[PDB]
Amino acid sequence: KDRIEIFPSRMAQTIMKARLKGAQTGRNLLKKKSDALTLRFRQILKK
Amino acid sequence: QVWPVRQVRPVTEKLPANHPLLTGQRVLDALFPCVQGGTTAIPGAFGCGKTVISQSLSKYSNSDVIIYVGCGERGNEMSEVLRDFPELTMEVDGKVESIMKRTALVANTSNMPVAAREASIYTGITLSEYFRDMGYHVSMMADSTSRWAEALREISGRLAEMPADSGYPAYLGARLASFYERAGRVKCLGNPEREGSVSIVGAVSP
Amino acid sequence: YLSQPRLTYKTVSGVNGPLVILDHVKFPRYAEIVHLTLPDGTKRSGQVLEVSGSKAVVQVFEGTSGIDAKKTSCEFTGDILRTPVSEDMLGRVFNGSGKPIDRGPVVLAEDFLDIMGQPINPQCRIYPEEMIQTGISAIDGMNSIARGQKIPIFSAAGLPHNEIAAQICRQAGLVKKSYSEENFAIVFAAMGVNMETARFFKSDFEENGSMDNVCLFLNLANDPTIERIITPRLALTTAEFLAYQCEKHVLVILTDMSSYAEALREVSAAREEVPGRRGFPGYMYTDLATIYERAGRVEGRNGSITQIPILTMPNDDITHPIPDLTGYITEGQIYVDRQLHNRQIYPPINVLPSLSRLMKSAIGEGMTRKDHADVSNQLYACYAIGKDVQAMKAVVGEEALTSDDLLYLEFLQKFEKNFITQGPYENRTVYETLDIGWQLLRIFPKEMLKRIPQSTLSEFYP
Amino acid sequence: VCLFLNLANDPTIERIITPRLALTTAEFLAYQCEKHVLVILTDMSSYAEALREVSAAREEVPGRRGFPGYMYTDLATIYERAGRVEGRNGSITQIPILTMPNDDITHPIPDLTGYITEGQIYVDRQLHNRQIYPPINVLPSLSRLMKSAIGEGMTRKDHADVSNQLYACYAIGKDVQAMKAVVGEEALTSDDLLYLEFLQKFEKNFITQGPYENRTVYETLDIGWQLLRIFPKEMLKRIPQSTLSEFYP
Amino acid sequence: VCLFLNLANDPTIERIITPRLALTTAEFLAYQCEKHVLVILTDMSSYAEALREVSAAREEVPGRRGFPGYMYTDLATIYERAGRVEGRNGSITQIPILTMPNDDITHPIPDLTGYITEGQIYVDRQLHNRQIYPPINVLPSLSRLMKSAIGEGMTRKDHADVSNQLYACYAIGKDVQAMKAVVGEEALTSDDLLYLEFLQKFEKNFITQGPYENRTVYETLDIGWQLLRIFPKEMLKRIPQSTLSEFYP
Amino acid sequence: SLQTSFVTLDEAIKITNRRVNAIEHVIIPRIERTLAYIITELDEREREE
């Protein structure tokens, strides 16, 4: 399971590169959303 | 004298690393010490001021003789070095001595024949070994080991040799091991008793 | 010189592919040129490739079709390929081999030169100091080109790079400080190109009154490969003559060296050398180095040479050998992004991944202006922040934004509206670009200009 | 002490001959003098590199990563000279030391090492980053001879089952730690806390050891029992009940 | 039926001749007796292997993966023996079976067979793992039926449209299945649940079919219509309006 | 009203943090390993040729 099941080929490489970029961007946006929610969390907890 | 470049000059014996190497910089001197006769590496990507490290080494060091070496440096990038390096200054009893008579430069551009680029490193280590048998403390710096490596790879490809993992031929590890062990502190060979050593630092372009 | 008569042979041992085996040759030379005469009366030319014993093999540029085994003949120049060169070559066009394409006469040989060229003594190289005006806001303000800096451009296939090159050629020039622009010249070289984008060049460069300082070379795709490999060296040698033997500053432009690499693969396959990485000979690195490192200033001369080649990236792969090695032996790069082309922005330059290694010396107070570096750095940083803020808006919504975020978004929008877009003919001066940058900067309030020293802000912001 | 030296500056090709001479000496001492001999080789990676260089010069059929195809026979020849022989009190023990090119274990060198020897010890760079003097990863380090010198009469009755239970508990600990790395902390159960405590005490006491410390096997089993007592009696599914009654208190 | 039997224990060299020995008899029966023929071949991978044996023995320049270059022309030769012909009756229907090296669709043999045969039917390992007696993946499959099965004398008018709609629906269902593997069930809309439910019903009823269970074509189209009725009529975009009014209720 | 909103807020926060950790510590290492394996296999094919 530690290796995604796909035969080696150039287009496997391209597809995996694209998926890597998409996953990285999605992680960044999700971390941002968590940050904004935590900012609101702290702000309403001011008092 | 004439001495083959691929042969190690013999020595009477080898000695442990005892004396510490000094640099004017505080951080490198205090927390990550070097030794007289040690081996160091440092990245060499663009945008970092390793030229300042070169100047700090050349101005201020326990050593007395220095060798800058080159194996292809993108033309103008080492043209800057050739312009600015001879203008540097020292202090010896207040005398400027900006001639840098403690440095010898060996440089190569990209268009020089591959053999020259490959053999520049061995030329440098031969010269440092000679000036170490003189009886001094010597220091060497390499410009970019990766470019030497790809020059070696190209020379191998010219003769149509079996490529190893990631294309570079099998010589790499053994050659680097030999090259780096060529350094160290020793007692020189000769009737007047004396001693010397060879520090070394190298660059890596990941 | 040569005083002995030229020789002729008819011994043809055989043919294999584009090569021709001869025999019984007295002291053949390595790369000496020869001519061929088919029995039917056609003329041809070729270059000696390999030599062994009394045998000598020769490649033919125009192809080996129609060669007769016993009724052909050949002649030996007895010498290496030389070029006629002269300063009056401006206004002309050629086909790589030097044969004129337009209706002009043969070039008078003011001098003969060896096409292979020579290496340059590193001791004489002088650090580039000045900057070349290009008329493009992206290339001049956001980035820069020094007198000697070798800057390639990457661009995937099917994107408008020839247009960028043509506009650069049209609007090239020097900064007017107040031995003027007459010293500047251009050598344009296009290889392996369609018949379209060739008529376009030869017409448009004529339509804008600039042939007085241009020396142009064309080599269509259907031409012999040996013409393709030969041409760029010819261009470089004429550039060297015009720049160093005569005091000129020369801007060389090369297009699509990937086809040059293809021709290199061709000649390698002909010689039957074992391919390596991705079917490319290992020594192609040193070959490209030979085609490079013909730039920079030299002591004892007031001239300069500056190379700006273009490349076709296969499938947006930075780790492909061609762009990777080119980066290893060049001092920066300018990117072109597909999304910007889809956004109908005529200059599609994406200035974020691009970088020029010699900014610090190309500009300054004695140069265009003192505030230039500060303005450039501030513009880059705030654009990065603006892209980040658009990403922020992608989720957080417009109502959750601050005034600062609105400033960043508006600045970004106006920036691609004005700073990037130029038009196919708008020749902007450097001062004009800096003025536009200042106008865009004024949108932000005074305090946010963190990258701007206070004195410059007082001088220019009001 | 018998020493055979080879610095890196010596000719590469001589390294191919270097080990066989030492092995011949070991055989002589073992089977003509009844000397119990231990043998150590610093780096077979250099041997593999030199053999690769020779083969590349000889244009021989390549294999994985352009290595010579016949390392199997060669390495078997080098390592086979070990064990004991009937009617003689000599013996030979081999302890080579291998340097991986990097963290990978599927590189051909260790892969062909795996088939030969009846076990292997593993050293983990991560544990060395934790400043543990013997940074040993137990999990990838089985020994194929845990049968003929273990049990009552050799070391002690309750040895093998203790080893197996410790292996299982450590593996479960690694699994739950991986789960905690993602799910969080509040979602973990009591048994997970017990396993984490077991890991912490096991790494603090068992593997940790002085540069000169020398523990007997008996106290090692005592420490193992002390660690095992943390869990309840019923959770040790890897141990028979009789031993549990015999040694738990 | 006429059989030719070449077994694994026989010498491999005669495999080069065997298929032509079959096809010559086939074409004689198809063009000198006007008898319709269904000719079956199987495991062409062994035929390609025999070609590799011969090529390697003859030291010719290898192409892809040691296979000779002209084996493309060879396969063109061995597959171009079907189709009707005027002035006569009868024909040949060619159905080879192809054993698959690992599971790489992009292996040379399947690729070159893909450039010659008009279509291909695909057998999938996942379906066989999930216990489906005809484990066939519709997605990679394709044939040239666009002009054959229409309805004017063939099955019926709505046939091809129904088939295309089912194919599109299955593709979207697999897309939803991929979507569900990422996020939880909460993000599912009504459309996603509909698509998943359709996927299970289609897999469990349409494709699932025991041996000897002959099904009429009209019955298959009726089953497809039953599957289609699950979705409300608005989302069936491919269907022409007249057919939608006629058959959906 | 303040604390009632706060409840839903912290629940959404914990969910998002859990999702972030899940994306970070699972998918990316698998992708990197797959890419390395693919590069190795293509290198092997080229060497054999």
Q: Can you tell me which residue has the tokens 């405590």?
A: D197
Record the tokens describing residue D227, joined without a space: 């660690």
Domain boundaries, chain C: 1-462
Using a CB-CB cut-off of 8 Å, the residues of chain A touching C353 are none
CA distances from E21 to B112, E5, E25, E33, E90 (A): 66, 11, 7, 18, 20
The subunits that touch chain B, with at least 3 C-beta pairs less than 8 Å apart, are C, D, F
Q: Can you tell me which residue has the tokens 């010069």?
A: D57
Using a CB-CB cut-off of 8 Å, the residues of chain A touching F28 are 20, 23-24
Record the tokens describing residue C228, joined without a space: 């393709």
Phi/psi-derived region of residue C403, left when phi > 0, alpha when psi is between -120 and 50, beta in every other case: alpha
Residue B203: φ, ψ to 5°? -105, 155
DSSP string for residues in E115-157:
TTSS-B--B-HHHHHTT-SS-B-TTT-B---TTT--SSSSS-T
Q: Which residues of B5-44 are buried (b: 16+ CB within 10 A; e: fewer)?
A: eeeebebeeeeebeeebebeeeebbeeeebbbbbbeeeeb
**C83: enclosing H helix or E strand:** strand C82-85
E144 annotated as a binding-site residue = yes
Using a CB-CB cut-off of 8 Å, the residues of chain B touching D56 are 161-162, 169-170
- Beta-bridge partner residues of C35: C45, C75
Calculate ∠ Cα F38-F41-F45, nearest 5°.
135
Of C335, C379, C460, nearest to C142 (Cα)?
A: C379
- Which residues make Cβ contacts (< 8 Å) with residue C189, sequence separation at least 6? C217, C231, C232, C235, C252, C253, C254, C255
Do D182 and F48 make contact, defined as CB atoms within 8 angstroms? no
Specify the length of chain A in residues: 47
Query: How far is it, in rounded angstroms, from Cα B125 to Cα B7?
Result: 10
Phi/psi-derived region of residue C155, left when phi > 0, alpha when psi is between -120 and 50, beta in every other case: beta
Q: Is the C-alpha dihedral spanning C374, C136, C412, C327 positive or negative?
A: negative
C-alpha count within 13 angstroms, C-beta hemisphere, residue D18: 23
| Test mutation, C121, C127, C264, chain B, max B CBs within 10 A | C127
Contact B187, B126 (CB under 8 A): no
Based on its alpha-carbon atoms, the radius of gyration of chain F, rounded to whole angstroms, reads 21
Kindly state the DSSP code that residue C102 receives in the 8-state scheme.
Answer: S
Q: Is the C-alpha dihedral spanning B152, B153, B154, B159 positive or negative?
A: positive
Instruction: Decide: residue B153, CB within 10 A, 0-12 exposed, 13-18 middle, 19+ buried.
Output: buried
**Distance from E107 to chain A by nearest Cα, in Å?**
10
Query: How far is it, in rounded angstroms, from Cα A13 to Cα A7?
Result: 10
Do E102 and A9 make contact, defined as CB atoms within 8 angstroms? no
Record the tokens describing residue C245, joined without a space: 């033997």
Which residue pairs from C243-246 have beta carbons closer than 8 angstroms and sit at least 24 positions apart in sequence?
Answer: C243/C185, C243/C303, C243/C304, C243/C305, C244/C298, C244/C301, C244/C303, C244/C305, C245/C111, C246/C87, C246/C303
Nearest to B167 among C127, C277, C296 (CB): C277
DSSP string for residues in E12-75:
GGGGGTHHHHHHHHHHHHHHSS---EEEE---HHHHHHHHHHHHHHTTPPEEETTEETTHHHHH
- Which residues make Cβ contacts (< 8 Å) with residue C131, sequence separation at least 6? C144, C145, C146, C147, C175, C362, C363, C367, C368
Contact E54, E69 (CB under 8 A): no
Residue D24: φ, ψ to 5°? -65, -45
**Distance from C123 to chain A by nearest Cα, in Å?**
45
Q: Which residues of F3-18 are buried (b: 16+ CB within 10 A; e: fewer)?
A: eeeeeeeeeebeebbe
How far does CA C277 lie from the centroid of its chain?
Answer: 25
Instruction: Decide: residue E144, CB within 10 A, 0-12 exposed, 13-18 middle, 19+ buried.
Output: exposed
Which residue pairs from C4-10 have beta carbons closer than 8 angstroms and sit at least 24 positions apart in sequence?
Answer: C4/C78, C6/C75, C6/C76, C6/C77, C6/C78, C7/C75, C7/C76, C7/C78, C8/C73, C8/C74, C8/C75, C8/C76, C9/C73, C9/C74, C9/C76, C10/C70, C10/C72, C10/C73, C10/C74
Q: Can you tell me which residue has the tokens 């159960």?
A: D189
SS3 A6: coil
Residue F4: φ, ψ to 5°? -65, -45
CB atoms within 10 A of CB C452: 18
Query: How far is it, in rounded angstroms, from Cα C88 to Cα C327?
Result: 35
Calculate ∠ Cα C154-C158-C162, nearest 5°.
65
Of B2, B5, B1, nearest to B178 (Cα)?
A: B5
Of E44, E21, E26, nearest to E114 (Cα)?
A: E44
Specify the length of chain D in residues: 249
Q: Nearest 10 degrees: CA dihedral of D23, D24, D30, D33? A: -140
Kindly state the DSSP code that residue C89 receives in the 8-state scheme.
Answer: G
Label each residue of D31-73 as H, E or C.
HHHCCEEEEEECCHHHHHHHHHHHHHHCCCCECHHHCECCHHH
SS3 C276: coil
Kindly state the DSSP code that residue C215 receives in the 8-state scheme.
Answer: E
Record the tokens describing residue B164, joined without a space: 């190893």
Q: How far apart are the first and last CA of chain C?
A: 70
B160/F contact by beta carbon, under 8 A: no
A9/E contact by beta carbon, under 8 A: yes
Do D7 and B181 make contact, defined as CB atoms within 8 angstroms? yes
Of E31, E45, E106, E107, nearest to E75 (Cα)?
A: E45
Residue E88: φ, ψ to 5°? -130, 180
Record the tokens describing residue C200, joined without a space: 């376009």
F43/B contact by beta carbon, under 8 A: yes
DSSP string for residues in C138-193:
IIIIIS--BTT----EEEETTS--HHHHHHHHHT-EE------GGGEEEEEEE-SB
**C376: enclosing H helix or E strand:** helix C372-396
Residue E105: φ, ψ to 5°? -60, -30
Q: How far apart are the first and last CA of chain E?
A: 47
C-alpha count within 13 angstroms, C-beta hemisphere, residue B134: 13
CA distances from C98 to C197, C216, C217, C297 (A): 20, 11, 9, 28
- Beta-bridge partner residues of B69: B106
Closest chain E residue by Cα to residue A5: E103
CA distances from D51 to B170, B179, E167, E192 (A): 10, 21, 58, 60
CB atoms within 10 A of CB B71: 28
Using a CB-CB cut-off of 8 Å, the residues of chain D touching B181 are 7-9
Kindly state the DSSP code that residue D83 receives in the 8-state scheme.
Answer: B
Do A29 and C396 make contact, defined as CB atoms within 8 angstroms? no
Query: How far is it, in rounded angstroms, from Cα A18 to Cα B194?
Result: 63
Do A33 and C395 make contact, defined as CB atoms within 8 angstroms? yes
* Resolution at which this structure was determined, Å: 4.3
CB atoms within 10 A of CB C89: 20
Query: How far is it, in rounded angstroms, from Cα C300 to Cα E168?
Result: 75
Using a CB-CB cut-off of 8 Å, the residues of chain C touching A14 are 315
Query: How far is it, in rounded angstroms, from Cα B25 to Cα B45?
Result: 20
Using a CB-CB cut-off of 8 Å, the residues of chain C touching A16 are none
Query: How far is it, in rounded angstroms, from Cα E168 to Cα E201?
Result: 16
C-alpha count within 13 angstroms, C-beta hemisphere, residue C160: 16
**B186: enclosing H helix or E strand:** strand B184-187
Query: How far is it, in rounded angstroms, from Cα C76 to Cα C60?
Result: 14
Crossing angle between the packed helical segments D190-201 and D159-183, to the nearest 10 degrees: 120
Do A41 and F39 make contact, defined as CB atoms within 8 angstroms? no
Query: How far is it, in rounded angstroms, from Cα C131 to Cα C139?
Result: 11
CA distances from C163 to C138, C160, C204, C255, C417 (A): 15, 6, 11, 11, 20
F11/A contact by beta carbon, under 8 A: no
Do C391 and A33 make contact, defined as CB atoms within 8 angstroms? no
**Distance from D110 to chain B by nearest Cα, in Å?**
16
CA distances from A27 to B169, C298, E180, F17 (A): 40, 52, 18, 11
The subunits that touch chain E, with at least 3 C-beta pairs less than 8 Å apart, are A
The CATH code that applies to domain C1-462 is 3.40.50.12240
Position B106, amino acid = V
Closest chain C residue by Cα to residue B206: C328
Residue C304: φ, ψ to 5°? -160, 165
Q: Is the C-alpha dihedral spanning C444, C447, C450, C455 positive or negative?
A: positive
Query: How far is it, in rounded angstroms, from Cα C57 to Cα C22?
Result: 6
Contact F8, A19 (CB under 8 A): no
List the determination method: cryo-EM
SS3 B106: strand
SS3 C78: strand
**A10: enclosing H helix or E strand:** helix A10-44
Closest chain B residue by Cα to residue F44: B165
Contact C318, C326 (CB under 8 A): no
Instruction: Decide: residue C224, CB within 10 A, 0-12 exposed, 13-18 middle, 19+ buried.
Output: buried
Do C296 and B75 make contact, defined as CB atoms within 8 angstroms? yes
Contact D170, D139 (CB under 8 A): yes
Using a CB-CB cut-off of 8 Å, the residues of chain A touching F20 are 27, 30-31, 34
